[PDB]
């Protein structure tokens, strides 16, 4: 059987509500007066009453904004009965897809990450890994993260002792002169940004990396 | 049988093209590899190639802007055959509705209308009827017309001897002093405006009414 095409609806709709979607009817209406209903999560199951259908026309509507991070897809069924109570069609599958909007900023697992690097390490020495997560769709830009260092303290012998791999979160030395007797700890502020790290449209968050110089 | 919901598309789309509409597939794809096509006016019949479908996905698309005043609705059918040439579904009806935009200004049947009114007629005397038509949807604002008088020449004994019923196009005297020996002919410019006569968003046109005073 051919499947009723899915309805694709972006989350966080402004409305106004209720909002008409599509019209579901039976061709048996040619000789019979029909009554339409819908069942399933979003309809007669939790969360109740988000989608509704006009008993007479079969016009399907949505009554509230949706949130993809709560429910990504709704499986409903449409029902047809005539005015004498006769069931005239087998109930038919309907699919509503909720389309992602970038409505979550990246989140770091820990607010403070700790790591260490030996005294006198050569440039290009691996130090530690920091990472974030994004609650939006991973397969979209809305959930794709990039990393950068915003500040380093203290600023000696070089104000940029480290860099960070912008996709992996790996922190690595790019400079020499790490001496425990001179400077014992560095504090870096790490930023994560979604939308592939786009500075204009991405959402960002920050975290702290503390790096101790060892013997 | 439940009918595939109609696709409602406004005319004069900006695109860009090709533009994805909906996805039509068969649930027999669970065990079979399927090939999809579409037939009908707009597809394989004049006008050819306006709607197309991806053989593999079943994604339906439109390739050009539409014009409601040429074709208001398209009746297509979707077809499913497997890779061994087996027809796996009966072809299914698809309906595309073209939604009206206000893209036609009112048109007068004649550019010059002629009528007459007897000398010394009392105020409220019926004179003639002028009308226009609109090629847009009559049941929408885009094709609903209102009428008004823009100018009268000459401007004596009163610069407004006539009025016009704004919905009927009936022209009627509102003033006395029609005297053939004094002024023999009036020339009125009549405007028609759609969108229920809305001066901001309506489209307009004009015509000329020549009214002779008789004995
Ligand atoms: Ca959300
Ligand atoms: Ca989201
Ligand atoms: Ca995000
Ligand atoms: Ca048109
Ligand atoms: Ca039109
Ligand atoms: Ca019009």
From Swiss-Prot, chains A, B:
It is found in: Cell membrane; Cell membrane, Sarcolemma; Cell junction; Cell junction, Adherens junction. Cleaved by MMP24. Ectodomain cleavage leads to the generation of a soluble 90 kDa N-terminal soluble fragment and a 45 kDa membrane-bound C-terminal fragment 1 (CTF1), which is further cleaved by gamma-secretase into a 35 kDa. Cleavage in neural stem cells by MMP24 affects CDH2-mediated anchorage of neural stem cells to ependymocytes in the adult subependymal zone, leading to modulate neural stem cell quiescence. May be phosphorylated by OBSCN. Changing residue 103 to A: Abolishes dimerization. Glycans are attached at residues 31, 114, 166. Disruption phenotype: Embryonic lethality. Disulfide bonds: none annotated. Residues 1-108, 109-215 form the Cadherin domain. Expressed in cardiac muscle (at protein level). Changing residue 80 to M: Loss of calcium-dependent cell-cell adhesion. Ca(2+) 1 binds at residues 11, 67, 69, 103. Ca(2+) 2 binds at residues 11, 69, 100-101, 103, 136. Changing residue 134 to A: Severely impaired the binding of calcium to all three sites. Changing residue 14 to E: Loss of dimerization. Ca(2+) 3 binds at residues 102, 104, 134, 142, 194. Homodimer (via extracellular region). Can also form heterodimers with other cadherins (via extracellular region). Dimerization occurs in trans, i.e. with a cadherin chain from another cell. Interacts with CDCP1. Interacts with PCDH8; this complex may also include TAOK2. The interaction with PCDH8 may lead to internalization through TAOK2/p38 MAPK pathway. Identified in a complex containing FGFR4, NCAM1, CDH2, PLCG1, FRS2, SRC, SHC1, GAP43 and CTTN. May interact with OBSCN (via protein kinase domain 2). Interacts with FBXO45. Three calcium ions are usually bound at the interface of each cadherin domain and rigidify the connections, imparting a strong curvature to the full-length ectodomain. Calcium-binding sites are occupied sequentially in the order of site 3, then site 2 and site 1. Calcium-dependent cell adhesion protein; preferentially mediates homotypic cell-cell adhesion by dimerization with a CDH2 chain from another cell. Cadherins may thus contribute to the sorting of heterogeneous cell types. Acts as a regulator of neural stem cells quiescence by mediating anchorage of neural stem cells to ependymocytes in the adult subependymal zone: upon cleavage by MMP24, CDH2-mediated anchorage is affected, leading to modulate neural stem cell quiescence. This is Cadherin-2. It comes from Mus musculus.
């Amino acid at each position: 059987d051919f499947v009723i095409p899915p309805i694709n609806l972006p989350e966080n709709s402004r409305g106004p509500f209720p909002q008409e979607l599509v019209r579901i009817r039976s061709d048996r209406d040619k000789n019979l007066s029909l009554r339409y209903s819908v069942t399933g999560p979003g309809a007669d199951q939790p969360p109740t009453g988000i989608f509704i259908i006009n008993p007479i026309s079969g016009q399907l509507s949505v009554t509230k904004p949706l949130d993809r991070e709560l429910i990504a897809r709704f499986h409903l069924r449409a029902h047809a009965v005539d005015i004498n109570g006769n069931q005239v069609e087998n109930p038919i599958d309907i699919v509503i897809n909720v389309i992602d909007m970038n409505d979550n900023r990246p989140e770091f697992l820990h607010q403070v990450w700790n790591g260490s690097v030996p005294e006198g390490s050569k440039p290009g020495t691996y130090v530690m890994t920091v990472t974030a997560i994004d609650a939006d769709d991973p397969n979209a830009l809305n959930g794709m993260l990039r990393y950068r260092i915003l500040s380093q303290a203290p600023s000696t012998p070089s104000p940029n002792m480290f860099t960070i791999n912008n996709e992996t979160g790996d922190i690595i030395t790019v400079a020499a002169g790490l001496d425990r007797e001179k400077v014992q700890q560095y504090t870096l502020i790490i930023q994560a940004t979604d939308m592939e790290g786009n500075p204009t449209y991405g959402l960002s968050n920050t975290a702290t990396a503390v790096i101790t110089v060892t013997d």
